[PDB]
Each structure stands twice: as C-alpha cells, then as structure tokens.
Ligand binder design. Structure first.
Ligand SMILES: C/C=C(/C)C(=O)O[C@H]1C(C)=C2[C@H]([C@@H]1OC(=O)CCCCCCC)[C@@](C)(OC(C)=O)C[C@H](OC(=O)CCC)[C@@]1(O)[C@H]2OC(=O)[C@@]1(C)O
Ligand code: NA
Length: 994
C-alpha cells in the first residue's frame, strides 16, 4: 500500500488479510515474498577487474596508441641486426604508458563511492516481526520482511521498512527522521489516518519510514511497502534514473579525440598519395620490405606525435592542487572534473537557513496590547538587544531600558515562552559560550525570558552554568505542565496544558498556552489580554495587530513572527483525546491574544558582498526558503537579490503557486525567478530540469536524502559539511562551513583554474601540431626520421609536462568575476587562434625537420650530402655509385635527431612563455610574471642534458651531445618563434578587437 497513511488501521489489516495479534501465516509470507520481492535495494553492478581494465582501452586515443604499440612491436621483431638494446625499447615504453594509464583508472573506481550504495547504510540488518508460526516476537533479516508483516520497533531501532503504525504501546512515540530532512528534531507519531492521499511525508504522522530511527517509545505496525517502493527506495530509483552528462571539457576532449583520429588517418592517405610515384618504379630492384617498414615507422611516429600523452596527467595534477587550495577556503570538492563545471556556474540555488543565514535565532522585537477603548487602540512595542543565545541583553521601549515586570502583559508573555517550549540553554565550559539545546526558534524564546526577568529574580549572584536556565526555572515552578499538543503544519501552532502548583485538591484553574504562526492563532482569538484584564477581540484591534506583524515580517527587519495566546478556560482534562492530533486545533480555540514575538535569523556577514559578486559575474542567485512568500521576498531585498524597490511579482513563487502553473509557465518562471518559498519535495529537481532546459550550469544545495536526486541532477550539487553522509556523496562539493560565500569563492577559483587550464591545454596540443607536421614533412619529402617515438614521448610526458604544469599557476585576471559565465560550448581553439597555432605548428614542423637536414648538409661534423640524395637515402645501400662517398649508416646518425629534438625542446620552452597570455605581448606581461614557469624550464633543460650525457640515456633516445656551434644553430632557428607569435599577438590586439 503506497497510500496506507490515508487508510485506517482496520483497512490496512483488511487489505493484506492479516491478523494484528498473530501476524502473517507462513503461506502468506511465501506469497507476499514472491509478489513483492525481498525488502532491499537492488545490488549495484559488480564491475569486475577485467571489465575495469578493458574500459581503460575504450578511449579512441588510447586505442590508437595501442595500435601504434603493436606495429612498433612487430617492427622491433622483424628486423636485421644485433643491436636490440634500442629496438624493443620503443614498443615497451608505449605499452608502459597504457598500463600505467590503466592502473590509474582502476585505482579510481576502487576508491569511488556512489550515493546509491550510501543509502544501504540506512537499511538495518535485522527486524522484529510477529508471524502466526510463533507466539513471541522473532527477529529476522530485514530483507525477509514483506508487505503485510506485523512489525515491532522500539527506541534505538532502525526502521526496516515503510510501516503504517497500528498501535503505540508506549506513552508517546518519537522518531528521528533526520536522514530525510536536516532537522534532527524528533517528531511525534500517532495511529489516526491522514485524510489527504497526496500528503507529503512530513505530514504522514502515522507512518514510519525505512531508514529512520526511533528516538523514543515502542510501537506496533503493519508493513506498507518494501524495497524500492519505500520513500527511500523511490529516491534511489530517481537517482539511478538520473543521467549525469560529462563536463564541457570532457566533451571537448572527447571531440578532440574523434577529430585527431580523422586527421591521423587523413595524413596516412596523404603520405600514400604523395608517394604514388612508386607505382611507376620497376618491380625488379629496391626493397619493398624496407619501403614498407618506412611507411609503418612514420605511422607509429605520426600517432605518438599527435596524442598529447602527458595532457591527462597535467590536467589531473592542476585539479588536485586546486582542490587542496579550495579546501582551505572551506570548499571540499569531491569530483576533480567538477572544478571546470563549477567555474561555468550560471545559476546558484541556495537554501536560506544555515547557508544564507546563521541559523542563530534571536528575539529582536515584541509587542503586547496596552489599551483597547472603543475605536481607539494602543500597543506596547519593545526591543531586545543581544543576537547570541546568551542571556546577555536588555529590553527597551523607544530605545529606553525598561523593567518587564512592570508590565503584566509581559509577565504572561514570558510565561508562554518558557512553558510552551521543548528547548533549553546550556553554558559550554569547553567552548566558553552559551549553546542551544533543541530548536533554534524555541531556544530563542528561552534566551528571551532570561533577558526579560518578569519577576526580578536575583540572577547576578548565580554562576555561569546556572545562569543559563534561571528565569525559565522560576516560571516552571509556577505552573505544572500536564501535557503538550505537538506542532503540526495543518494548524501551524503548538500548546501546553498547565495546572497551578499549589492545587492538590482542585479541578479549577487550568491554563493552555499557545504559540505558532500569527494568522491561524489570531483567528482563533476571541479575546485580548490588556495587562491582567481581558476584552473581546474586535475588528479595528485585530487589524492593528496584523498590521505590525506585516511590518515586522515584510519590512527591512525581516522577522519571523510568533503569536502567543492563552486559553483562559481550557476544556476539562477528561474531555480531551491526546492521541487524536486532528482534534488539536479544536482544543486551541476561544483563545486570548497575549502578544507577538519577532525573531531574526540574520544573514551571514559575507553574503551581502558575495551576492554582489554573482551579479558582477553574471551569476543568477535563487533563494529557497521555508519563510512565507512575503518574508522570503523581504529577505531577498535585504541581502541584495532583489532591489529594495523593484517589482518581483513574476520573480518569486511559493510551492503552491508553482504547482498551479502549467508545465509551460513553470519552465518560464524558472528562467526569471530568484526566490522560492514553501517549496514542495519534488520542486528542487523540477527547478534544476527547467534551468537545464535553458542550458544553465546549475548549482544546488541540500542536506538530506530528500534533496539527493536534485543534488545528483544539478551540474554542481552542493552539500553542507554538517549535512548527511548520503547528501555529501550525492554532491560535487561540500561546504565545510555551510556558508554561501564559500560557493562564490569556489566559483571564482573555478574560473581562475580553467583559464590557466586553457593555457597548458592549448600549449601541449600546439606542440603536438608541430610534431605531426615534422613527421608529415619527413614523410612527404622522404627524409630520414628527424624525431622518433621514444624522443617524442619524453617531450610530451616530461620536457613539456613541467612547463604545462607550471602554466596552471599563472596569475588570475583581476576581472575574473567582472565577466559573464563562460559558455560550455566555447571552443578552446578557433578563429584567429586556430590560425596562430596553424602557423606555429608549421614553424615547428619545419624547424625540427630543417635542423636535422642542416646536419646532413651544411654542417662541419656532417657529410657534404646534397638534397637530391638525402631524399633517396633508402637507395644508398644499393645504388652506391649514384651516392658515392661515405657510409650508408650515416643516415641513421644520432646527431641530426638530437638537433631536431633540441630544437623541438627549445621552441617549446619559448612557446611556453608565449602561453603566459593569449594576446598580451611579453613586453607587456614579462616571463617573470610566473616564477614557477621559469623554474620549470630550467628543470626541463637540465633533464634534456641529462639524456644527452648520462651514458645509459643517450643510447636509449638515440642522442649525441651537441657542439657549442651546433647548439648555437638550435637557438638560431628556435628563438625567433617568440617573434612570430608576438606579431600574431599584435595583429590580434590591433586589428580584431572590435
Ligand atoms: C596534434 C596535431 C594536429 C594534427 C591536431 O591536433 O589535429 C587537428 C584537430 C584534432 C583539431 C585542430 C587540429 O587541426 C590541424 O592541425 C589540422 C592540420 C593538419 C596538418 C598536417 C598536414 C597534412 C586543432 C588542435 O588545431 C590547432 C590549430 O589548434 C584545434 C582545436 O583543438 C582544440 O580546440 C583543443 C582540444 C581540446 C580543434 O579544432 C581540434 O579538433 C577540434 O575538435 C578542436 C576544436 O578540438
Ligand atoms: Na550532480
């Protein structure tokens, strides 16, 4: 039964055909188990180790590298020679990267925990049932529990399934439904049916939800639903059905792989098309076995030259360090790729209480009735100082200190606040401050009566701990609390039944003290306290009361108002049913209005400016609160969301108003709203969807399992540090200090990181562009290989990895938050920038190839080989007289490759400096603006010389130490790359900035 809350206890027992006294028969247990299944959320997909390794080879680029590893392995096999010490090195390194890449991918899934499995933390192992096969209670496995089962719970027990309460054996039953919401304040349950079939869980006062705890009491019930059909199971299904898209960077990177694959293939065809002329070569002569190895050697090199092998490592490093940085700013980011998404945040939906505000309640104002004389009326307004829970403050009338005891109305006022209260104070000796015990709202009343002191009790003589509950205890000794009628949202109030102390043999003198929302309470007030006297409630007076309430709540005070009334003649104790909470409003009628208290939940000191930062950054901020629409709007105006005098009729909605709109007007409302009050449980997810329908990168806050699907759906789900474990696991970021300002600080940091990420991404890919051209040129012209896979890998992983990493430490722009959010579809390289790297790559490709060609020709250490024979170097071993001179093995010399490599390295060191700013020249933004970058370049070169001198290394990379003259030639051809980019930057700054 999904609607068991609306059904009577007799109807639920009738439905399943079960006896409350005996329970389900063994046949019924069988039939119900087979029908509804076991009481458990389905097990997650057990991704095996082998299946996990395979996923690491599903990426397009790692498959290309895998293919390039195979050809390299085959070529390292089928070869003539005895020097295999530098043959199987190349295919082994490529394989090592793939394996190392596969190791990391497995290490992540090993440590990653999804929120769906975090929900299984809330399903207990055991559960107690009554079945017909036994007299006493039998504790069985909770998964074996079925709908229709008669279950028993007690204090400490974790509720095994969604249960319709049948009988409460103890006096009262308190349940901790904190895993659903955030308020750990235990709620009271009953057995009477809840009329509304479409009632929310908060109002289902006769249900026990799977996962919650019995704070107090012991009761018997019948299982309504199990497994995924429970409230927590229905949430699990929503999360499982929620499909989270990849971050914009991941979508661009994936796009990059798709296109890099095409290019790689295209080039291969191009190389073949250029060498079509080999079809006109005689079949007799030459070597088709050496001609094939050449075309396969350059193929392997082409792949390695294309893939930014070091990029996924550099990205991860930047994010991990940024995460550590954000952690110090109270922002705990859980997913590394979410850092980018965080910087693209266009809309931030934050809860008010605890985040936008301090959740530190404090009574600021209050008023009683001073005089009612016909059409004439006067109130007595007061003000209270001190915003802390400490009993340190005074009461003022017109800014003048007054004694509360001199007002009879205020004595009754304080009496209500002390007795109609389930909270208290406690001075912490460890911290040294007064902390709250219970609800923040009720505790604010506890603090108030300590400041008022209507009886002028000697409180300056007491200690610090005894000072906490002083004036309260004085009032408690006056009236004896018989019982309390709990709060309920249907009547929005609570009350306490009290009898006088000195009254052992009497039945006359009882009083009821009511508190709650002003509207409902005042409507039930037929009388008015004027000091000790009482007058009938009249029109003009009632309006005078409601007006001030409207002013305090909707004004710049933004106060939450509570109405306090007393029932002078409460119904007889015997004529009251304390189990039927439906009759409570009736019990709280014919009241006498005493006064109204106004309390403030002050906004954080940093929220005001943080909101403004968002306005500057084009980030819309939406408030979600429990306040009424009027107060909600007022608080928005106070914190700067709304202009103090701007129209907001179409920018603020209640949950009910939002439901009354058609689906078309709902989507429209979300694109312009900034304030949601009294929101219904399903609305957070709905709002996110609508925001996503406008392609908004949405941030969303929450702290309970109720908000879990919304947190998972939003691009950046945000959880509170004081929040639940499931909410945290369902989020992308955790606010350690629960502060809204932490969010904004995180977004700014998110922008700074991605800007630097744009740099080393474009820097590394730019290098790969130049490398490919080098491989293409050396294949098109038919030149000996200038750069080999082993060398290119060292560059892309180490030599260029260090400057790339350093580019992630580039100083952020000063106008970071003075710019609109970045469009997710904004490409990393396009337009004139595409042309720049198109030119730079062409330069690098020519410089590296040219440097190798320079050694074969116009070099002293090199031969006098002409161009015509350098392109036909594969024919020197056969057609000797055509190229008579030196040995044919000189075409495999290590010197020209070192010249190419050193040029590649040097240029990329220069291009790293060119990557400090996109358009700003080095004359405007010097290289020493980034000290980390300069240090990285020094290290990269030190590692370059490392593999040039340390004997085991230059053999592996096929390198030889360059002469001073040769090194000069490297600088002659490398350094002017700065001038080239400088010109291109100059063209961008003066002929494109429109
Ligand atoms: C490693 C070497 C090059 C070949 C390369 O990256 O491939 C291209 C390709 C994949 C794109 C291009 C490259 O285009 C070429 O260089 C083609 C010329 C071929 C010359 C050879 C002679 C026959 C990028 C690299 O060119 C330069 C000019 O910047 C820019 C950009 O890249 C980005 O925006 C960064 C990716 C996150 C992408 O156009 C990108 O694909 C698109 O989806 C984007 C948006 O990605
Ligand atoms: Na999410």
């Amino acid at each position: 039964m999904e609607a068991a809350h609306s059904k009577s206890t007799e109807e639920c027992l009738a439905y399943f055909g079960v006896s409350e006294t005996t329970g389900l028969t063994p046949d019924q247990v069988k039939r119900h188990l087979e029908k509804y299944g076991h009481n458990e959320l389905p097990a997650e997909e057990g991704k095996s180790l082998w299946e996990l390794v395979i996923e690491q080879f599903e990426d397009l680029l790692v498959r290309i590298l895998l293919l390039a590893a195979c050809i390299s392995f085959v070529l390292a096999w089928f070869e003539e020679g005895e020097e295999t010490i530098t043959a199987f090195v190349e295919p082994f390194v490529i394989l090592l990267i793939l394996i190392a890449n596969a190791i990391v991918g497995v290490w992540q899934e090993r440590n990653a925990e999804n929120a769906i499995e975090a929900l299984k933390e809330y399903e207990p192992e055991m559960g107690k049932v009554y079945r017909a096969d036994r007299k006493s209670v039998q504790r069985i496995k909770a998964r074996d529990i079925v709908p229709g089962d008669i279950v028993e719970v007690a204090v400490g027990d974790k509720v095994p399934a969604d249960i319709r309460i049948l009988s409460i054996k103890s006096t009262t039953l308190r349940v901790d439904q904190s895993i659903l919401t955030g308020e750990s304040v235990s709620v009271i349950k009953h057995t009477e049916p809840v009329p509304d079939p479409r009632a929310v869980n908060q109002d289902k006062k006769n249900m026990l939800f799977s996962g919650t705890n019995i704070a107090a009491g012991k009761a018997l019930g019948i299982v309504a639903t199990t497994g995924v059909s429970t409230e927590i199971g229905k949430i699990r299904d929503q999360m499982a059905a929620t499909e989270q898209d990849k971050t914009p960077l991941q979508q661009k990177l994936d796009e990059f792989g798709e296109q890099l694959s095409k290019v790689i293939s295209l080039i291969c065809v191009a190389v073949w098309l250029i060498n079509i002329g080999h079809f006109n070569d005689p079949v007799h002569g030459g070597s088709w076995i050496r001609g094939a190895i050449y075309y396969f050697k350059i193929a392997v090199a082409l792949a390695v030259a294309a893939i930014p092998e070091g990029l996924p490592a550099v990205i991860t490093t930047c994010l991990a360090l940024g995460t550590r940085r954000m952690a110090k700013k109270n922002a705990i980011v859980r997913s590394l790729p979410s850092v980018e998404t965080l910087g693209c945040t266009s809309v931030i939906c934050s809860d008010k209480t605890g985040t936008l505000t301090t959740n530190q309640m404090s009574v600021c104002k209050m008023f009683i009735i001073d005089k009612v004389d016909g059409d004439f009326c006067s109130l007595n307004e007061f003000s209270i100082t001190g915003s802390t829970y400490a009993p340190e403050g005074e009461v003022l009338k017109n800014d003048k200190p007054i004694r509360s005891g001199q007002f009879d109305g205020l004595v009754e006022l304080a009496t209500i606040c002390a007795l109609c209260n389930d909270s208290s104070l406690d001075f912490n000796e460890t911290k040294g401050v007064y902390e709250k015990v219970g609800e923040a709202t009720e505790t604010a009343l506890t603090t108030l009566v300590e400041k008022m002191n209507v009886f002028n009790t000697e409180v300056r003589n007491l200690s610090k701990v005894e000072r906490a509950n002083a004036c309260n205890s004085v009032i408690r000794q006056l009236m004896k609390k018989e019982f309390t009628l709990e709060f309920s949202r249907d009547r929005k109030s609570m009350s306490v039944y009290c009898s006088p102390a000195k009254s052992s043999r009497a039945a006359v003198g009882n009083k009821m003290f009511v508190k709650g929302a002003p509207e409902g309470v005042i409507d039930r007030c037929n009388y008015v306290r004027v000091g000790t006297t009482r007058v009938p409630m009249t029109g003009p007076v009632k309006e005078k009361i409601l007006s001030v309430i409207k002013e305090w709540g909707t004004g710049r005070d933004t106060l939450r108002c509570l109405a306090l009334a007393t029932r002078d003649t409460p119904p007889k104790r015997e004529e009251m049913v304390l189990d039927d909470s439906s009759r409570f409003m009736e019990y709280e009628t014919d009241l006498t209005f005493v006064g109204v208290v106004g309390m403030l939940d002050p906004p954080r000191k940093e929220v005001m400016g943080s909101i403004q930062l968002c306005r500057d950054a084009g980030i819309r901020v939406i408030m979600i609160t429990g306040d009424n629409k009027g107060t909600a709007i007022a608080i928005c105006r106070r914190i700067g969301i709304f202009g103090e005098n701007e129209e907001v009729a179409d920018r603020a909605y209640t949950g009910r108003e939002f439901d009354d709109l058609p689906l078309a007007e709902q989507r429209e409302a979300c694109r312009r709203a900034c304030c949601f009050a009294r929101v219904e449980p399903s609305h957070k997810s709905k709002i996110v969807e609508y925001l996503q329908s406008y392609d908004e990168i949405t941030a969303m806050t929450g702290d309970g399992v109720n908000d879990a699907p919304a947190l998972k759906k939003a691009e950046i789900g945000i959880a509170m540090g004081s929040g639940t474990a499931v909410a945290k696991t369902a989020s992308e970021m955790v606010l350690a200090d629960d502060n809204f300002s932490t969010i904004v600080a995180a977004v700014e940091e998110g922008r700074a990181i991605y800007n630097n990420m744009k740099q080393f991404i474009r820097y590394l890919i730019s290098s790969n562009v130049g490398e490919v051209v080098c491989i293409f040129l050396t294949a098109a012209l038919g030149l000996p290989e200038a750069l080999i896979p082993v060398q290119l890998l060292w560059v892309n992983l180490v030599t260029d990895g260090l400057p790339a990493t350093a580019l992630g430490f580039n100083p952020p722009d000063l106008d970071i938050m003075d710019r609109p959010p970045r469009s997710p579809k904004e490409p990393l390289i396009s337009g004139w920038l595409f042309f720049r790297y198109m030119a730079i790559g062409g330069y690098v490709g020519a410089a590296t190839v040219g440097a190798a060609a320079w050694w074969f020709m116009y070099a002293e250490d090199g031969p006098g080989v002409t161009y015509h024979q350098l392109t036909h170097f594969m024919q020197c071993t056969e057609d000797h007289p055509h190229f008579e001179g030196l040995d044919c093995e000189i075409f495999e010399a290590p010197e020209p490759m070192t010249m190419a490599l050193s040029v590649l390295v040097t240029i990329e060191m220069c291009n790293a400096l060119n990557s400090l700013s996109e358009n700003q020249s080095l004359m405007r933004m010097p290289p020493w603006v980034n000290i980390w970058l300069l240090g990285s370049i020094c290290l990269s070169m030190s590692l370059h010389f490392l593999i040039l001198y340390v004997d085991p290394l230059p053999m592996i990379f096929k390198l030889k130490a360059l002469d001073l003259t040769q090194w000069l030639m490297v600088l002659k051809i490398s350094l002017p790359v700065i001038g080239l980019d400088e010109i291109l930057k100059f063209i961008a700054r003066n002929y494109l900035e429109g």
